[PDB]
Design a binder for this molecule. Structure first.
Ligand code: 07D
Ligand code: 07D
Ligand code: 07D
Ligand code: BPH
Ligand code: BPH
Ligand code: U10
Ligand code: U10
Ligand code: CRT
Ligand code: CRT
Ligand code: CRT
Ligand code: CRT
Ligand code: FE
Lengths: 44, 259, 45, 274, 255, 45, 45, 44, 44, 45, 44, 45, 45, 44, 45, 44
């Protein structure tokens, strides 16, 4: 409702969403190492 | 909101909660505790009543005992709820018409679940706890005992169900039509007849030759609703106990030509 | 810029986001239904 | 004969058509032009139904049946001995129902009240038309309308519901059943509450809206109101009829397969398809 | 020979006929209850008690039941209190079934859709004994929901676009929470206020004023709306009179 | 940053948490249903 | 002649026209039912 | 409603009913010429 | 409703029913050359 | 003109339009039902 | 509301029903060139 | 041009659009039903 | 070229976009219903 | 509804509907090259 | 640190506890469903 | 909503839309290289 507090909310929201996306990317990299999810023309 | 339970409400809630927990646990165990399979087969899951060889005694837990326990607890909860709605009406210094209309539904429920199995000697043909299982019980009951369409009390129950729908569509429409004349204040109209009640009665008189009053239309509605389940319960009790084939009964009594 | 004069920007954002999410979910489910584009249980071309 | 309060309401005007010719009463019945048409169609249809009974094999009321023309006839009008009588009775009944609804409209206009009652009767007329006109027309033959018999229309219901393996699995038919049961439950509750307020027991004083709301709040947790209950009941009955019409339109014109087999999509959902 | 009572009779048929007997008795009882208002039937012309009835007239009309009210008074049903035979209208034909033609102004004469029942001259009372329907000034506790638009201050318009006045007050119901009447200050003869039923008034949505449209009557009919004796309470008879006058607009507005 | 003045950060956060949990549950259930990616019941790759 | 004073021209004509139209439609459908007078699917005599 | 309007209405009514009956009679005569609708003793 | 606007109505109403009947007659005539709809003694 | 001085088209125009359209639709559907005049199928004579 | 405004409506109403009818007629002409819908004596 | 005062110039447009669209849909579905004019399937003459 | 005095711009734009979206969805499903134009399954010309 | 703002709608509405129709025409052309939907005498 | 001013600590804790309990119950049910991880039955590896 | 507010919504809204369309185009390009969704003459 107030500009300064909303701005600092965006700051902490970015600081949290970047961590969330990094964790998700690391998890997806591990899952891709385990079993990739894009089949080739001959399949899996 | 401001729901008054009291001692009877506490009892009824505890009994019904135990019954619901037993039914749900049995349903979840039937799919080997899989949430995925539970969601997949939720409609098809059911808790079947015991076989005929066990009679009215206690069947093993895995073979209908859980059904018997859950059914008894549910029956006790429903009877205590009837007592609750009787006592609430008595406490508010009001009539027990709601309790005595619920009594007809309870009569039908007991006829389907307990009274007819008591007459027949076993719980094999009782209603299982499950959506599609109880739909299939309905279908198989009608198919086994001739054709339920040919049951005269099933005829009457259907007639009174259609009559309940017809009577509510008439009454709600009439009250909305006279809502601009204060027709929604029905008890006030009963105590002091107003132009809304007068015009409703006159409309129905000019339409179909006869009319009701603001109280007697509710008497008509109450009796139609009660008679639906009452006639249905009578038909359920008479099905199989005294009439094994309703189609053959109808053929004997002229409802259908002889094959 | 007058589209936001006619329509509440908050409501426009909410409705657009919900519609996009539902459309994406529907298209993903359709692809999963199809044999060729089912990337999970992939079948040979 | 008149009631104690009918003379001041028996006034001129309110007719949709015909003017003063038919603005009169015969006993308690208001006649009207649409009432004259209702009598015309009722007499014609009843006489033709009795004629079909005479043509039939039995005079038993249960076994009297007027059958629609064979499916081989398609939508063509059939000879009177081979379903044409059924078609004439069907259209005479449609005319009688429409004229009855318009007579109710005229009575509403005369009394200065709303048209909710003819509007609700319109849904019953629509259900009947869908069963005898709309569904057979979209199905391709008059033979799919139910025969006009006490038992033969029940046999038609049974055969039509078993043509789709099990009619219990029709999704709109389940909703129609739910709303039909709820309409009866709500009617029982409403009549019970009104009668319990008007008759609070011998030696007790008549109760009011406060007590009516308090009773159901205390018992079940919430109430609807004095006019909300009537609106809910009307909407429930009309929704039950509408969903019955929808299930009948789906069963055969649109969907021709097995309704129990229609439910495999739930078990084939991606999050449970194992 | 499972359910056989005799060679042809059986238990299901016996129970069915028992239900038929019970249902006939129930229909008799329900008609008895139906005949608690407006009966016995009177002759259309003379008004004397006369109708075509059979041997069931002995059982047709039940003994008067007594309704005990919280105010100490009692209401009997049937009360056998008939309306006056003479009314301010004349039949178009000498036949019994002929309709009536109003002699003068039907809206003021209260015939047809303008007719009202002679209810008690007493306002509806809540559980606490206070009058149920009062203006918002007398009931400071009640308020209109913030999600809804307050009709107060909104112009009152008819179906032809003529403005009848402005809403200055709302009449609420304390027993069953709802808005019953709108107090409208007429544009003509300033200072005159008439009651306006809520159920006969629809809000015109997005008109930048949300004009409370009255489809019942026209603007010129607002001056003839029946008055009320008290400024903070309305009796049942006055209530009926107002609703009946407004309900007759659809039939006698253009006359 | 402007978002949080029009959208309440008490309702946006709750909606985001519920939507993300529902989406994660849906994707995990899909993976459990599929044969290749079912980690609890390990099949051939 | 005065019969048009005892009978409203408009109300009489509307009813007469509706009755005549319905009767003509009924007769035409009855003819379509038969085989000799079915002019659309004309059959040999 | 007035006498003159009623006379004009009766004049046009008798003219229209005569033309309607004449058209119907001509149609019936043509239909009879095409295919008569009175069966013979042995059929058609 | 004035009588002059009734005159205007009558005018364009008859001028339009004339066009309606003309186009209906033309369509029926064309359909008649295409396939006549009155069977002969031996049908079609 | 005198005819339309009483048969004013307040709703007679709508009534006539609804009558004519429905009659045309019914006749067209009947023609489609017949084999000789079904222009969409074009069966030989 | 006003007669002048009704006339001003009718102006572009006829100008637009004209273009609608022109598009419909042109589409019908193209469909006729593609596949005519009037069968001959022997059918299609 | 006075028919636009007779009838609401908004309801008239709405009803005409809804009628023309429904007629077009009905005709297109009929053509899809016919074998000769089914452009999607495209049967030979 | 002044339709927007007659119809509310907001209701017109929330009633013309929904119509177009529904029509597009219907046409896409119809194309999916045909062998020739089903791009997901895929068949010969 | 002011006439000037209404005219501004008309202008931008026309521009947007023209863009929509241009995109639809491009898509329909691409589909026409892909697989035409108008069969020949021998079909597809 | 500012979360307990924004969200109500009384409702947030109850919601979090309910969510955690539901998630734990769901995961334990799934484990009981699986053959490998059904600790009560104990299938061989 | 004020004019400046509407203009601000507009510029950053189209700024966010351009990124969304770019991401969608990149994803669709990747899916096309994986497996094209437009069948050829004979099929896939
Ligand atoms: C092959 C299938 C078939 C068939 C072809 C056919 C035909 C038709 N029939 Mg029938 N019927 C068939 C079989 C069949 N038929 C029913 C009954 C009826 C009814 C139900 C009335 C009601 O209100 O039930 C509804 C009332 C009940 C069942 C009792 C109320 C229950 C209460 C108070 C308990 C309170 C509940 C809780 C506290 C919650 C507990 C929680 C948990 C368990 C988890 C009725 C009116 C009715 C309608 C139609 C029509 C209109 C048709 C048409 C159009 O085809 N049929 C019988 C009966 O006696 O009904 C009273 C009965 O038992 C039975 C059977 C086996
Ligand atoms: C199996 C691969 C596959 C597949 C066959 C397919 C088809 C097409 N997707 Mg894609 N897509 C696939 C996968 C997939 N997709 C997306 C989504 C989206 C969005 C993004 C939102 C947006 O605003 O896009 C922006 C929208 C624009 C760019 C609208 C411009 C449209 C134009 C110029 C006309 C389109 C028609 C043609 C060019 C015809 C040529 C055809 C032939 C020669 C044979 C959206 C509308 C959209 C458009 C389309 C288009 C134009 C095509 C064509 C014609 O190829 N796709 C969904 C999404 O994000 O929804 C919010 C989503 O989740 C998801 C998934 C799973
Ligand atoms: C295989 C057998 C089977 C099966 C297992 C099963 C199960 C159940 N089903 Mg079902 N059903 C089966 C068959 C089947 N099912 C029905 C219909 C329904 C409905 C519609 C009710 C309605 O709205 O009537 C609406 C009623 C109408 C048609 C109103 C028309 C009446 C009018 C205009 C007025 C007429 C007035 C006069 C003539 C004048 C009288 C004069 C004087 C008295 C003087 C509905 C809700 C319903 C009830 C149940 C239940 C509760 C069950 C239970 C207990 O399991 N079923 C369908 C229908 O009619 O839809 C419109 C239909 O045709 C059809 C089929 C084929
Ligand atoms: C006249 C016939 C119609 C009818 C009438 C009817 N039904 C009725 C009534 C009436 C008049 C009531 O007064 C009564 C009612 O209250 O209605 C609102 C009712 C009723 N009929 C109902 C339903 C119903 N009615 C139906 C139909 C019909 N009944 C007919 C159409 C149908 C069907 C099949 O068509 C159904 C399913 C119920 C809603 C209600 C009766 C409620 C009841 O008996 O509840 C029993 C109590 C329980 C199951 C307890 C549940 C507890 C929960 C688990 C909550 C948790 C509690 C707590 C946590 C427990 C303690 C835990 C600790 C011990 C650890
Ligand atoms: C739509 C919601 C419900 C509803 C509402 C409803 N019905 C209504 C009304 C309303 C609001 C009336 O105002 C009106 C009325 O006045 O009722 C007293 C009516 C009415 N609905 C009625 C019955 C009825 N309603 C039914 C159902 C319903 N109507 C719905 C459940 C049903 C069924 C099957 O469930 C029936 C049987 C009547 C009591 C009445 C209709 C009065 C009427 O139509 O009068 C004119 C006609 C005659 C007097 C006789 C006509 C005879 C025909 C020439 C022959 C018809 C033959 C028929 C096709 C088959 C007969 C054999 C059958 C066994 C198959
Ligand atoms: C606010 O609370 C409300 C009340 O109120 C206070 C109520 O009350 C009610 C209403 C509810 C009840 C009263 C409870 C009972 C209702 C039900 C259980 C619903 C079921 C209803 C029935 C089973 C009854 C059905 C009966 C019907 C449909 C009436 C049948 C009527 C006719 C067939 C004739 C109709 C009359 C006409 C058209 C004219 C009159 C006809 C005659 C008198 C006979 C013929 C007359 C002549 C020969 C002379 C005239 C002839 C003419 C003009 C020529 C015609 C030519 C021919 C020969 C054809 C409600 C809902 C309400 O909520
Ligand atoms: C003069 O006027 C009068 C009043 O006014 C003054 C009135 O007031 C009333 C009274 C009428 C009403 C209050 C409503 C009437 C309308 C209907 C009957 C149609 C609507 C149907 C319902 C909402 C069912 C209501 C029935 C109840 C609450 C019975 C209460 C029973 C118990 C508390 C016992 C335990 C409860 C059990 C076992 C189930 C009870 C049924 C439900 C609560 C609904 C079913 C719910 C599920 C089983 C799953 C769904 C779960 C939900 C809803 C929670 C999650 C959220 C979701 C949306 C899924 C009348 C009659 C009246 O004449
Ligand atoms: C008056 O008192 C004052 C105020 C002074 C002081 C009071 C202090 C109090 C009362 C303090 C209390 C503190 C407490 C008790 C704090 C509790 C903290 C806890 C326990 C926090 C835990 C948080 C856990 C989180 C946020 C977990 C998130 C996990 C998620 C979203 C995981 C999702 C998993 C998914 C979707 C996948 C599941 C896999 C399957 C297979 C199930 O998918 C289908
Ligand atoms: C006031 O007036 C001004 C000044 C404005 C001038 C205006 C004048 C006007 C408007 C004049 C208009 C005159 C018109 C239009 C007159 C029209 C007259 C017509 C067309 C009259 C038609 C009469 C037809 C009658 C009465 C037919 C009766 C036939 C009957 C009842 C036949 C019944 C047959 C049966 C029952 C048998 C059927 C057999 C089958 C086979 C169908 O049975 C199954
Ligand atoms: C008032 O403003 C202030 C001053 C506060 C400034 C603040 C501004 C802020 C904070 C603004 C926030 C802006 C944001 C975050 C904007 C985000 C915009 C986005 C992401 C917009 C996206 C739009 C997408 C559109 C319009 C896409 C439409 C796609 C359609 C209609 C596709 C339809 C496809 C069909 C029907 C395909 C069907 C094919 C199948 C086969 C599925 O059909 C059966
Ligand atoms: C938190 O936990 C949750 C709530 C998640 C657990 C989940 C519970 C769920 C999902 C519960 C509900 C499941 C379903 C699908 C229920 C559906 C039930 C239906 C539709 C039932 C329908 C009909 C059943 C009837 C009519 C059965 C009546 C049975 C009776 C009256 C049986 C009475 C038995 C007696 C009196 C037994 C006597 C023998 C004794 C025990 C006395 O001696 C042997
Ligand atoms: Fe009363």
């Amino acid at each position: 409702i107030t500009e300064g507090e909303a701005k600092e909310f965006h700051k902490i929201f970015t600081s949290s969403i970047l961590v969330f996306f990094g964790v998700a990317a690391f998890a997806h990299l591990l899952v891709w190492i385990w079993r990739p999810w894009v089949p080739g023309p001959n399949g899996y | 909101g401001p729901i008054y339970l009291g001692t009877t409400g506490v009892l009824s809630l505890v009994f019904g909660f135990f019954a619901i927990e037993i039914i749900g646990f049995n349903l979840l165990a039937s799919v080997n505790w899989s949430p995925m399979e539970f969601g997949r087969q939720f409609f098809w899951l059911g808790l079947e009543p015991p076989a005929a060889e066990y009679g009215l005694g206690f069947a093993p837990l895995a073979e209908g005992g859980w059904w018997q326990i859950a059914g008894f607890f549910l029956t006790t909860s429903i009877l205590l709820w009837w007592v609750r709605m009787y006592r609430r009406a008595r406490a508010l210094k009001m009539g027990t018409h709601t309790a005595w209309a619920f009594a007809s539904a309870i009569f039908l429920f007991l006829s389907l679940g307990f009274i007819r199995p008591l007459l027949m000697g076993n719980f094999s043909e009782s209603v299982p706890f499950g959506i599609f299982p109880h739909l299939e019980w309905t279908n198989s009951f009608s198919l086994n005992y001739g054709n339920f369409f040919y049951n005269p009390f099933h005829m009457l129950s259907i007639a009174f169900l259609y009559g309940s729908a017809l009577l509510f569509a008439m009454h709600g429409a009439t009250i909305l039509a006279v809502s601009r004349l204060g027709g929604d204040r029905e008890v006030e109209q009963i105590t002091d007849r107003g132009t809304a009640a007068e015009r409703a009665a006159l409309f129905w008189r000019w339409t179909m030759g006869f009319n009701a009053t603001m109280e007697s239309i509710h008497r008509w509605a109450w009796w139609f609703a009660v008679l639906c389940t009452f006639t249905g319960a009578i038909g359920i009790l008479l099905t199989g106990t005294v009439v094994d084939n309703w189609f053959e009964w109808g053929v004997k009594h002229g409802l259908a030509p002889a094959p | 810029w007058r589209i936001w004069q006619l329509f509440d920007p908050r409501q426009a954002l909410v409705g657009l986001a919900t519609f996009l999410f539902v459309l994406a979910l529907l298209i993903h489910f359709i692809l999963l239904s199809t044999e060729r584009f089912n990337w999970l249980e992939g079948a040979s071309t | 004969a008149l009631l104690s309060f009918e003379r001041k309401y028996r006034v001129r005007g309110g007719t949709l058509i015909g003017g003063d010719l038919f603005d009169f009463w015969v006993g308690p019945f208001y006649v009207g032009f649409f009432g004259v048409t209702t009598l015309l169609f009722t007499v014609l249809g009843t006489a033709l139904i009795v004629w079909g009974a005479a043509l039939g094999p039995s005079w038993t009321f249960w076994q009297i049946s007027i059958n629609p023309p064979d499916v081989s006839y398609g939508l063509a009008m059939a000879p009177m001995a081979k379903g044409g009588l059924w078609q004439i009775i069907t259209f005479s009944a449609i005319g009688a129902f429409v004229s009855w609804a318009l007579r109710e409209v005229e009575i509403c206009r005369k009394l200065g009240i709303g048209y909710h009652i003819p509007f609700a009767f319109g849904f019953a007329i629509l259900a009947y038309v869908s069963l005898v006109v709309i569904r057979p027309v979209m199905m391709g033959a008059w033979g799919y309308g139910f025969p006009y018999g006490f038992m033969t229309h029940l046999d038609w219901v049974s055969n039509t519901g078993y043509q789709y393996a099990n009619f219990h699995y029709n999704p709109a038919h389940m909703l129609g059943i739910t709303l039909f049961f709820t309409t009866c439950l709500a009617l029982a509750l409403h009549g019970s509450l009104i009668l319990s307020a008007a008759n609070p027991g011998k030696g007790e004083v008549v109760k009011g809206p406060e007590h009516e709301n308090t009773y159901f709040q205390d018992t079940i947790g919430y109430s609807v109101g004095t006019l909300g209950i009537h609106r809910v009941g009307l909407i429930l009955a009309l929704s039950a009829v509408v969903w019955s019409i929808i299930c009948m339109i789906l069963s055969g014109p649109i969907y021709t397969g097995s309704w129990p087999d229609w439910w495999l999509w739930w078990q084939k959902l991606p999050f449970w398809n194992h | 020979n499972k359910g056989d009572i005799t060679g042809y009779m059986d238990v299901a048929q016996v129970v069915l006929y028992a239900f038929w007997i019970f249902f006939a008795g129930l229909i008799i009882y329900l008609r008895r209850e139906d005949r608690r208002e407006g009966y016995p039937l009177e002759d259309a012309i003379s008004g004397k008690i006369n109708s075509l009835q059979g041997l069931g007239s002995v059982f047709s009309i039940a003994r008067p039941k007594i309704f005990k009210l919280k105010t100490g008074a009692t209401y009997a049903a049937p009360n056998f209190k008939r309306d006056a035979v003479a009314i301010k209208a004349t039949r178009t034909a000498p036949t019994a079934g002929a309709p009536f033609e109003p002699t003068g102004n039907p809206m003021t004469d209260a015939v047809g859709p303008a007719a009202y029942a002679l209810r008690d001259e007493l306002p509806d009372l809540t559980l606490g004994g206070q009058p149920a329907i009062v203006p918002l000034r007398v009931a400071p506790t009640f308020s209109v929901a913030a999600e809804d638009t307050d009709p107060r201050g909104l112009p009152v318009v008819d179906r032809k676009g003529a403005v009848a006045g402005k809403v200055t007050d709302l009449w609420i119901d304390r027993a069953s929470i709802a808005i019953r009447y709108l107090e409208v200050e007429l544009a003509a003869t300033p200072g005159r206020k008439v009651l306006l039923p809520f159920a006969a008034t629809r809000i015109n949505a997005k008109t930048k004023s949300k004009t409370v449209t009255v489809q019942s009557i026209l603007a010129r009919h607002f001056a003839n709306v029946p008055t009320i004796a008290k400024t903070d309470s309305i009796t049942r008879r006055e209530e009926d009179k107002v609703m009946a006058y407004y309900s007759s607009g659809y039939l006698y507005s253009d006359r």
